[PDB]
């Protein structure tokens, strides 16, 4: 039950923070493709986006850090 297949997105955006936030943990970790049911191709992209965000301090690497 993938979101990105239905939406039909060409590429996942690191700037689209809200969207990312659904796929990240309360502890900051990226959520598995088993749980979200994201398609494999998209999942990787999502992960990459998240990573990018983390570099730009848009998303946090973890809950504890400060």
């Amino acid at each position: 039950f993938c979101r990105f297949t239905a939406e039909g997105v060409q590429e996942i955006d690191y700037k689209d923070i809200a969207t990312l936030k659904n796929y990240i943990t309360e502890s900051g970790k990226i959520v598995p493709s088993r749980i979200t049911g994201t398609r494999a191709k998209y999942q990787r992209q999502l992960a990459r986006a998240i990573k990018r965000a983390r570099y730009l301090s848009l998303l946090p690497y973890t809950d504890r850090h400060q």
């Binding site: 943990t25 309360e26 502890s27 970790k29 809950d63 504890r64």
Partner: protein
């Protein structure tokens, strides 16, 4: 697993919640894993072995199920 006790929340409940959060995180498990160095080979082996086991559980057992026990 950062948590804040809600207004008029019991202590025990809060504790339980915290525990749940911890479990979700898999923090303890992670710690256990990083206690000692696992050779790459060993890591590989476990992963594949585990996978195999899972597969066995899924299919062979299902086949067994079709036939009644008594």
């Amino acid at each position: 697993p950062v948590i804040k006790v809600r207004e008029n929340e019991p202590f025990d409940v809060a504790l339980r919640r915290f525990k749940r959060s911890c479990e979700k995180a898999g923090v303890l498990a992670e710690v256990r894993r990083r206690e000692f160095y696992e050779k790459p080979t060993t890591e590989r082996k476990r992963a594949k072995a585990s996978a195999v086991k899972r597969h066995a559980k899924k299919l062979a057992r299902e086949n067994a199920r079709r036939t009644r026990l008594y």
